[PDB]
Design a protein around this ligand. Structure first.
Ligand SMILES: N#Cc1ccc2c(Oc3ccc(F)cc3OCCn3ccc(=O)[nH]c3=O)cc(F)cc2c1
Ligand SMILES: [Mg+2]
Lengths: 546, 407
């Protein structure tokens, strides 16, 4: 049946129809608008309406130009619909077949009819030259309408549903305006089934030209290029201009990002750091040498051509991660050794205090999430961390944390715990009661410590907040102490930052505390309530007060 | 026919994106949904319906059969409130068995206008094909209105058995049913089977299974003070800190004498004898903790809140409260599942148990404070869930440090 059932569309609740007066344009423009417009009515795309309809929408526009209509006002009045996922299938998930044909659909939007009662809101009055003619007042899915994509896709779905069931041997992936079909039957049968499907489309008014031979492989998808047994991104290009602008950074980062899918080792952190302000695409920012080196390294890997294999459910799914350093991580997902399904990169989520273990865990979830999306199953992980390192970490962590089934891979740099804090006080280690204060009105402040041996110290500080002195009081105790030391503090802030077990921080003082912690053999950090008169905590708090 | 239902005024239909599903779960949903469509319980929907409710598959404990599950938590909050009394005997009953009665909910149709709010989408892998869109034509499992609309029918069904066994306590939670008696387990199971046949006769893929509880064995974990003979400075420090923390719950706690022992700057490892007066202060504090906190009683209007702490060695602590420091219940689980391999599973098992204990006692689920990062919980929490309901939760990314108090 040529008729295709139309989806009911209703204007937004309590919303009126769109009425926008057409802007006066040149006569040559209206001389062509009424030209194509008459053809569309001959084709049945549009129908002239009586003067009763009040709604209106503006109409603007090689050898000739094309028509257009801005239904944004109409779109605002139009109701919300289920939206097709913007995600595009990644080739790494695409399974291998003997033949693969791509059937494009011609004028899918125009081919799809529209809800009868909604057609009143698509009126677009036609302009008249010099107002010398009465204004000329859609029957199908209009181009540019909010509900057009979903309606056309949803319409196609119901259309294709019967053919799929009748021919389960063929697999038909659905994407906007395109229809990708593959099968493992003989080449003659595949071409045969392709024609059967095209006829089923015509029976509902759908043109998928095979007369013009469908583009044979290779196929260049909008995302990347594809082949019968391999997939790769479109070739990259390197300007190598002596001076780069702001818009140069985004273009290079964007193009490099797309390359990280198949080409391992891509790094964009240094480049992104250069465009910190990114004030104006026209603004020009000088290149840094660290970023320049990143491009030089990126250029090396980019030179060699790379390809990825398609997925085989029989083969296992493996993901391998390595630490690039400075918060950068590269991973590879492969079913067969040396042959990668896909490659990617992860960057540290914004934070003030971090360590290697957590960042690795974060990468797993990022890989795990992408894997379930592209294949529907978690991969086995080859991780650069000793099983004992992980057991110590996750068991001692205060939060719940877990990593899927994984194996150790000896490829450096390995993930390790740079320092571990004792759970019980170190007997025979000098005890350091610490406290630090700072005036709110005057940034000036002080920080010091007291010990059981009588040792003491107080240091005046300037341009310091109360918390900084609390951490500053700990730095001193670490420097002026031996390899084994107990530290008693009242600062929950300092404790909450050390019980987070960081190995690199955005605060230089934290790093210097980390550096002493790495140096020391054993360190036990205890906490006591402030102003509770607990031991030397009151003695050390008084010395640093104001 | 049907009962009218509308959303709370000013609240639109729930629209929640369908989180990506494993291929195994995607297949299971297609088979369940494909048969239900044949049964007419669900029907396809076009793009006109912009609402969406998440759906995923689960397998009950010791169950090889996939059960469809829909996250109606957003729809439930948007659904207009109704207008069941919660029996206290369940907690005292020696045994309480749970039965999945959600199948009966499918017999009753639902209003057409509200059916648009039950839209759920079966996802597709690698965005290869547009996901399948379904809508409930009957009372959907996991909905708030489903147990209420069917409630009257459930009573008429359970009327004869209730009269036959008045001592037995029956309580119904959405998609579930709890039956409690003090009889022996053998007779209890027999009565349960009799009740199963009762529903079968008036009518269940999961009706045969039975979950056994013993609320009589349930007990609350109290806050205790270690009794030692050699008290070190660090012991007194930690001991004093805990007591000062517990003062918020119990004002009577005093820490003066213990602080006196701390006077002076001494090493943590040095042992400090406890003065007789300090030992008395510890004794008086030890007594105050053996007694219940005053003015602590459940308020039906206030929602329950639950917090979990990862103590370690496969041990977890939880406290259920309606006010910041007014604790209604406190306990600790141990060896739940994957005790020494996977916390996410232990936390998922803990969230379930706590909810069960909450339902048996107050007929409603608490809001959970999950000691876990959001991305960690959202990635795997679906793989270990074995219940028909889903409570509320938020994540606490700040180190409490108070776990030692809840030891
Ligand atoms: N431009 C373009 C284009 C062409 C075919 C596509 C495709 O076609 C396929 C359709 C169904 C299917 F099962 C498997 C497909 O491709 C599997 C991968 N592949 C492809 C080509 C080939 O020669 N060999 C091979 O293995 C599936 C798909 F998402 C996107 C496609 C985009
Ligand atoms: Mg102080």
């Amino acid at each position: 049946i040529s008729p295709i059932e139309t989806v009911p569309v209703k204007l937004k609740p309590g919303m009126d129809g769109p009425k926008v007066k057409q802007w006066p344009l040149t006569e040559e423009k209206i001389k062509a608008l009424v030209e194509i417009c008459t053809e569309m009515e001959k084709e049945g795309k549009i129908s002239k309406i009586g003067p009763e309809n009040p709604y209106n929408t503006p109409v603007f526009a090689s050898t000739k130009w094309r028509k257009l209509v801005d239904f944004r006002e109409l779109n605002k009045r139009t109701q919300d619909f289920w939206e097709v996922q913007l995600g595009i299938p990644h080739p790494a998930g695409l399974k291998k077949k003997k033949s693969a044909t791509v059937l494009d659909v011609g004028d899918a939007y125009f081919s799809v009819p529209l809800d009868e009662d909604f057609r009143k809101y698509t009126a677009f009055t036609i302009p008249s030259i010099n107002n010398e003619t009465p204004g000329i007042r859609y029957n199908v899915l209009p181009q540019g309408w909010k509900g057009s994509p979903a309606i056309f896709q949803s319409s196609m779905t119901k259309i294709l549903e019967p053919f799929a069931a009748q021919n389960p041997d063929i697999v038909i992936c659905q994407y906007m305006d395109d229809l990708y079909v593959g099968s493992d039957l003989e080449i003659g049968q595949h071409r045969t089934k392709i024609e059967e499907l095209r006829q089923h489309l015509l029976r509902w008014g759908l043109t998928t030209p095979d007369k013009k031979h469908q583009k044979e492989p290779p196929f260049l998808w909008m995302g990347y290029e594809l082949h019968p047994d391999k997939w790769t991104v479109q070739p990259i290009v390197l300007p190598e201009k002596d001076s780069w602008t702001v818009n140069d950074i985004q273009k290079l980062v964007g193009k490099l990002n797309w390359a990280s899918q198949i080409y391992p080792g891509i790094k964009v952190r240094q480049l992104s750091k250069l465009l910190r302000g990114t004030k104006a695409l026209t603004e020009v920012i000088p290149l840094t040498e660290e970023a320049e080196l990143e491009l030089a390294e990126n250029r090396e890997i980019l030179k060699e051509p790379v390809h990825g294999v398609y997925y085989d459910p029989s083969k296992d799914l493996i993901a391998e991660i390595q630490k690039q350093g400075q918060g950068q991580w590269t991973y590879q997902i492969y079913q067969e050794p040396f042959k990668n399904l896909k490659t990617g990169k992860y960057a540290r989520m914004r934070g003030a205090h971090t360590n290697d273990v957590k960042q690795l865990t974060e990468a797993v979830q990022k890989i795990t999430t992408e894997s379930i999306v592209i294949w529907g199953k978690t991969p086995k992980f080859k991780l650069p961390i000793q099983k004992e390192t992980w057991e110590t970490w996750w068991t001692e962590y205060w939060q719940a944390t877990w990593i899927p089934e994984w194996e150790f891979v000896n490829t450096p740099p390995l993930v390790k715990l740079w320092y571990q804090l004792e759970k019980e006080p170190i007997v025979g280690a000098e005890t350091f009661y610490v406290d630090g204060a700072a005036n709110r009105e005057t940034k000036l402040g002080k920080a010091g410590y007291v010990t059981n041996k009588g040792r003491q110290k107080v240091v005046p500080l300037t341009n310091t907040t109360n918390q900084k002195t609390e951490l500053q009081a700990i730095y001193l105790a670490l420097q002026d102490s031996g390899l084994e030391v107990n530290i008693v503090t009242d600062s929950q802030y300092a404790l909450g930052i050390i019980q987070a077990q960081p190995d690199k921080s955005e605060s230089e003082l934290v790093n210097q505390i980390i550096e002493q912690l790495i140096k020391k053999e054993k360190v036990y950090l205890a906490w006591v309530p402030a102003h509770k008169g607990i031991g030397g905590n009151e003695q050390v708090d008084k010395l640093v007060s104001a | 026919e049907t009962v009218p239902v509308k959303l709370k005024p000013g609240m639109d239909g729930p629209k929640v994106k369908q989180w990506p599903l494993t291929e195994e779960k995607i297949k299971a949903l297609v088979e369940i949904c494909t048969e239900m469509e044949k049964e007419g319980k669900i029907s396809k929907i076009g793009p006109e319906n912009p609402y969406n409710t998440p759906v995923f598959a689960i397998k009950k404990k010791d169950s090889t059969k996939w059960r469809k599950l829909v996250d109606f938590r957003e729809l439930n909050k948007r659904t207009q409130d109704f207008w069941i009394p919660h029996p206290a005997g369940l907690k005292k009953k020696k045994s309480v068995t749970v039965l999945d009665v959600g199948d009966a909910y499918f017999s009753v149709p639902l209003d057409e206008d509200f059916r648009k709010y039950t839209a759920f989408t079966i996802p597709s892998i690698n965005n290869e094909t547009p996901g399948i869109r379904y809508q409930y034509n009957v009372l959907p499992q996991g909905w708030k209105g489903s147990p209420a609309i069917f409630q009257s029918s459930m009573t008429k069904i359970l009327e004869p058995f209730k009269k036959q066994n008045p001592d037995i306590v029956i309580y119904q939670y959405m998609d579930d049913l709890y039956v409690g008696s003090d009889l022996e387990i053998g007779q209890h199971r027999t009565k349960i089977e009799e009740l199963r046949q009762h529903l079968l006769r008036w009518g269940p893929p999961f009706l045969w299974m039975g979950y056994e509880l013993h609320p009589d064995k349930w007990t609350v974990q109290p806050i205790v003070l270690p009794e030692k003979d050699s008290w070190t400075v660090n012991d007194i420090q930690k001991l004093v800190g805990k007591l000062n923390w517990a003062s918020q719950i119990y004002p009577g706690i005093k820490v003066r004498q213990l602080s006196k022992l701390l006077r002076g700057t001494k090493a943590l490892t040095e042992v400090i004898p406890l003065t007789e007066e300090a030992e008395l202060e510890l004794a008086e504090n030890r007594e105050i903790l053996k007694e219940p906190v005053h003015g602590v009683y459940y308020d039906p209007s206030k929602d329950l809140i639950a917090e979990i702490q990862k103590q370690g060695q496969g041990q977890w602590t939880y406290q259920i409260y309606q006010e910041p420091f007014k604790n209604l219940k406190t306990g600790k689980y141990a060896r739940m599942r994957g005790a020494h391999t996977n916390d996410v599973k232990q936390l998922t098992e803990a969230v379930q148990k706590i909810t069960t204990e909450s339902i048996v006692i107050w007929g409603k689920t608490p809001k959970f404070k999950l000691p876990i990062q959001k991305e960690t919980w959202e990635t795997w929490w679906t793989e270990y869930w074995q219940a028909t309901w889903i409570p509320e939760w938020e994540f606490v990314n700040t180190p409490p440090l108070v776990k030692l108090w809840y030891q």
